[PDB]
Amino acid sequence: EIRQNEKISYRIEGPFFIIHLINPDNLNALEGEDYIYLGELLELADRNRDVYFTIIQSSGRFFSSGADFKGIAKKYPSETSKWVSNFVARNVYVTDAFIKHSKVLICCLNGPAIGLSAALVALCDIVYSINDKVYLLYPFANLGLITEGGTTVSLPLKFGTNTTYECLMFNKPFKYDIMCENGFISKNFNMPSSNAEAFNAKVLEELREKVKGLYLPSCLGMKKLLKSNHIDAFNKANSVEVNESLKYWVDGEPLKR
Amino acid sequence: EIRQNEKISYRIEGPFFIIHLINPDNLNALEGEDYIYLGELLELADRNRDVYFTIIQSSGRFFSSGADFKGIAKKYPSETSKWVSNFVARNVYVTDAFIKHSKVLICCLNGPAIGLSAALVALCDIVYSINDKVYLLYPFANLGLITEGGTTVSLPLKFGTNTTYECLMFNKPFKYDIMCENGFISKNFNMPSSNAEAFNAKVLEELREKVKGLYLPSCLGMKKLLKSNHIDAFNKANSVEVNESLKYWVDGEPLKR
Amino acid sequence: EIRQNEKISYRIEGPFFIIHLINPDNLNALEGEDYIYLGELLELADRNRDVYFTIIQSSGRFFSSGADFKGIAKKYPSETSKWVSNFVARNVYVTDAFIKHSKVLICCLNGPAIGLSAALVALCDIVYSINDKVYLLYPFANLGLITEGGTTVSLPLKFGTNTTYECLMFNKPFKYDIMCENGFISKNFNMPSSNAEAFNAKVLEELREKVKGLYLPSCLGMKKLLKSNHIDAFNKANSVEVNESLKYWVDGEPLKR
Amino acid sequence: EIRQNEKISYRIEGPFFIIHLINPDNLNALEGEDYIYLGELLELADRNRDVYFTIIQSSGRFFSSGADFKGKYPSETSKWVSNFVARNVYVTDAFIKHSKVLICCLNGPAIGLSAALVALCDIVYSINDKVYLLYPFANLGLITEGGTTVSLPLKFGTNTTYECLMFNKPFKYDIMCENGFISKNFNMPSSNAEAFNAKVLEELREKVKGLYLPSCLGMKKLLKSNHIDAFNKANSVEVNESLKYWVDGEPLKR
Amino acid sequence: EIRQNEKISYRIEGPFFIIHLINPDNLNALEGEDYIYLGELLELADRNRDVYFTIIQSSGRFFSSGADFKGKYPSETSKWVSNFVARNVYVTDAFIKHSKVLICCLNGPAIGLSAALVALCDIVYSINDKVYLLYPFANLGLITEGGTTVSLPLKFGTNTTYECLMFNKPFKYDIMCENGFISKNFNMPSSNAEAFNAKVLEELREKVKGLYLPSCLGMKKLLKSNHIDAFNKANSVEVNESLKYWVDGEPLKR
Amino acid sequence: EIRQNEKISYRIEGPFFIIHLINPDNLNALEGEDYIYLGELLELADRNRDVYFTIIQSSGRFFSSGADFKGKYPSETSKWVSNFVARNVYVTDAFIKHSKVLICCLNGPAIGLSAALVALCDIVYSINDKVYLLYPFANLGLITEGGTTVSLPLKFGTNTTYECLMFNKPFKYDIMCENGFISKNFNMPSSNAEAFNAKVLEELREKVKGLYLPSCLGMKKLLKSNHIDAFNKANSVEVNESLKYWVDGEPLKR
């Protein structure tokens, strides 16, 4: 068991643990406590012996527009203490939940993802797209922040170093063509952008077919070995990213933007 | 000198040590002792001061359909002792022979490669294809096994992480288009699939031309430096892969499949 | 301040430190002291708190034809002492200046680059091309040398391992199509090959536009994290490359070629 | 520059940034917000161009008895992310990355997270041979914290570290000496940490005469690169792997 | 659960999985299939949810004199892959990856591959000051085995390791002590390994009282990550690089 | 084979390549071209198939007082690249990569870059307990050189290394002993380095009897892999980061 969250649901269907972002009217923008809740759902999936795949699905036109700004609120003895509790803690936890996850993590990209949400997409093992209008945007340079959610490692790993610099330094999107040219997207479903619900069902239908006849413990044993290629780099980056962001928050520049 | 093997021949032509898989009627399926023999041939090439390139060629419609199942046979005090001797020993040795090889390793891909044979293809420095119908298949999830022959490292390195997951988790081939898009194949010769013999000769003809005027010790000096990028990762993966496979063999699941 | 160099100029325009190779009649071939001067200019840019981007531009039909052979000259107690002073010292210094540079390094590729110059291009963060006729050539195998300027790491990182072997082992160029397929070039300006001057101005015009509204310290903070992915590998390669080249120089083979 | 804290003071004397734990009646036990305050002070020292050495000094009979166990959330996970994870990752990182020479004046025992911070210092001086470090994780139902995963095997050896951590035994003075953890024992009475503290500073003043202090920092910058990756990896993994121990509830019970 | 082996017994007592080498008349020399059996026992202990400590004990005057030299193939390479490579990579990996706390009760000397396994244990207790470890690779015409490439410099220092390995000299008790390799010397007569073994278990029982044993395993899991990559790399390279020494024939001659 | 050098001789005796520093009147201080010559001699030894051990011996009261400060460029940077960077990266690399067993006969103190080379040797023997190593970088306005960034913490411990380097203090005999840096102290009078040198060679001759010498090299090849990456990284970074200290001018002033 776990508390209910009106913005994120989950369910289990056979070997699939399915997480669903269900706040399309706000483009599935997520507050700090929602990122924590995502980590807690990954923990549930990770401990469930019948689960082999964790599938993240969303709703409406965006996968997620990223961290919900409105959050702010109004209690802490310093600006540092405040940002350690609100930003550092949450980022280090949810990023670690993705990095360490032992089940096969699949993202169903129904639209654009931005910011920390787009970082989490880049931490997934497999990504499927609704159509060719999807993109990922990491607007750190425009917001006065730095890399988050393991993007320091994942973006050069999955898109190449030179491409990563052009996108990050100048606040440009990783568009569909860049995703395709780097094999980031394993299948494009070519469905209308209004059709996230049908897209999500179609991915699960194909997954049910694809797992027939496989020995699912092999999937997990192979993931365990594959994860060892970059696990150290991801764990180092996570700690450094969250601690180096603090000067940007405490300076105040992101609040201005 | 070395014993003769009716399934694998070798010869030396100038700076080229040429290994030839010559059992096309059985799709060049290899038994454990044949993988060991391949390692022994690599050792011969590696110690020969006149050799600068080790070229692996095959015959018929397949490069190699992988490990020969028929092997089985019928002596060991436990299932563990049996699999240590038959699987662990052989895999750790032939994989190491490829990883450490100091001469430029070139694979002439005359058709599909499967399993451990396809792992060895991914350990080569340069790969040439007969035509666009070649593929590599790593059927570990269908066989109830895990990554072998350094594929834990080589597949993400040469095909990208997300692509590797889609292929390995779901037992899908790395097809020609994926090989091309990742620069895995350096030249496609576009010859008919029946023509492995002519393909093999044509590769060697072009190689004779390409080495004219080069200082061949530079080739080896550059390889020695390039190998240092991933040598530690490959050596770590080899040990872990062979030892982690044992539970899959001892459990018995692969024997069923 | 710094001494003047008739072959290389520099200037500062806002957040841009601009280095210009200005010897088109000799294809911007560089002598040892010119590589050192490039390192000294990078040091100036690196220490200047108003500089966020270091832009390297050239002139005429070549970006740079590489190390200037004529150099030779005619004083050293041994061949080793001579090559330590003339080759090892200079390479280890200029390569380190590129590896450690904290500002965003952008290369404006107005034509082909060869040898050590082409290595430096591969160390830049972002590369823009004048048109599709550019290429990089690393002629080490024809010259009787080995990898230089961090190419041991940069070429497999940015072009893939198998491609790198085909190019380096056989003295073949990394052509435009290979650069494009690996995302090495962030934008091709598609201008006539005679038009380096207009190309250079156009890149700076677009850069002025692209930085509007960005928090430039974020660019540097992100680079600092991204650089940590491969900094150890580059520093190890630099030391090994320069010291392993000595036997090739002292043997005498490169002097013959 | 920074808020006041009744339990921790600081001052600058020439090239020395001196942090002083000043709550000897409670054995200098620290709450979560005090560890955060320590990180903030390290940031001040790190950014101060006149500072070359950061010296951490305490008071009374203990250096620090560790986290103060006396010292709104939608779940237990959310609570422990905010109270344990956040604070540990931040103060540990502040020590790991610190660019000034970090010197600990060990006036008595240190326990737990405080003792982890002592093991992150570059140089340690002891008041006398009664000092020890205790990492009581096995008795509390916790795991390694504050980079001890890396620092203890590095500075005390692997086999020694297992005997001490697995069985909740102290790293005593003799073990510290035999591994060169303590650079000097001042052999002074435990009833006067104030004199000890002053004597260390007096000897530091003498030792820096004639040195080019930027060389000290340049050397530290290179030396730190030997294990910086390992420490950063350990920090993320330690804080996240502890959560199951807190959320289980076992530490609350102990 | 597993076949019987006349030379090696095992039993479980509470949280302790106890492996006992019981062939004192042959100094507990082990054949290839016995090293494989040891790996199989470690796998049993590793998978047993009630086990927290794996204790390796022996008998008589030696812990183990190493590989038993008293103890069908198309080539010499094929033979040595099956007899040496396979067995060494498997038993070494079993030790490297083991998740339970591994304790060695050193009742006398250990030699060769057996002494490599002692250096892979987390904690080592000695019967008395007459124990030593000998790695006679240079005299046998072999190279490092059982992860000694990593473990010996890690636990004894690099310079010491070179003096011992290059010149076929023992790591004696004083060297073990000075490096903290031995956590406790029991100072008991060599004529009674049985009493030593019982005394170690008695003290372990006392030491675990009041501890949360899952913390022991959680801490080991983190500590192991410091050198796990190095050990796995060394294991593959050691076994494969030995082949030229066996296939040359030089060890057969010595 | 190689030019003569009045300050450094060499000879081969069986499996031993013996390098002898022979300028005791100037405490065997070495100029830049002499460090280059040392690298060239190591290359000779490394390529000689009959050589298994490279032994470095000196003369008089000092092993070496370090770089000789008594001992055309368009800039200060160009000058220091040619005179300091080039020479340091080359001789340090020669030591790091050397495939033969490197033994240092420490007849007296070593300072600076010479003392860095001593810390790169595989085995060190001392004439008596008066030897020390001094790395006076903080007093000279320089930083670590010759791989000391890695070797000193590795062989003496991190905390000890900081006390010595930050405060320009010697690594004395007792510190060398306690860390096992010295494999044997010969306890001979300082007035006869020649006898010391001969005695070391006599004992080496005895110790190699019955050994398969290719095993020594095979073992070194594996042992070297533990830290080779760290040493190569440190070498590039040390030489390049020193430049600002030389170009500033601070060392010239000291």
Curated annotation (Swiss-Prot), chains D, E, F:
EC number: 5.3.3.8
Molecular functions (GO terms): delta(3)-delta(2)-enoyl-CoA isomerase activity
Pathway it works in: Lipid metabolism; fatty acid beta-oxidation
InterPro entries tied to this protein: ClpP/crotonase-like_dom_sf, ECH/Chromodomain_protein, Enoyl-CoA_hydra/iso
Single GO cellular component term: peroxisome
Active-site residues, as the UniProt record annotates them: E145
The organism's place on the tree of life at top rank: Eukaryota
Ligand binding (substrate): S65, G66, A67, D68, F69, L113
Reactions the enzyme catalyzes: a (3Z)-enoyl-CoA = a 4-saturated (2E)-enoyl-CoA; a (3E)-enoyl-CoA = a 4-saturated (2E)-enoyl-CoA
Induction of its expression: By oleate.
Keyword Lipid metabolism carried by entry: yes
Compartments, record wording: Peroxisome
The keyword Phosphoprotein is assigned to this record: no
One BP annotation, GO: fatty acid beta-oxidation
Quaternary structure annotation from Swiss-Prot or TrEMBL: Homohexamer, dimer of trimers. Interacts with DCI1.
Family, per entry: Belongs to the enoyl-CoA hydratase/isomerase family.
Record function comment: Essential for the beta oxidation of unsaturated fatty acids.
The name this protein goes by in its record: 3,2-trans-enoyl-CoA isomerase
Gene source species: Saccharomyces cerevisiae (strain ATCC 204508 / S288c) (Baker's yeast)
Gene: ECI1
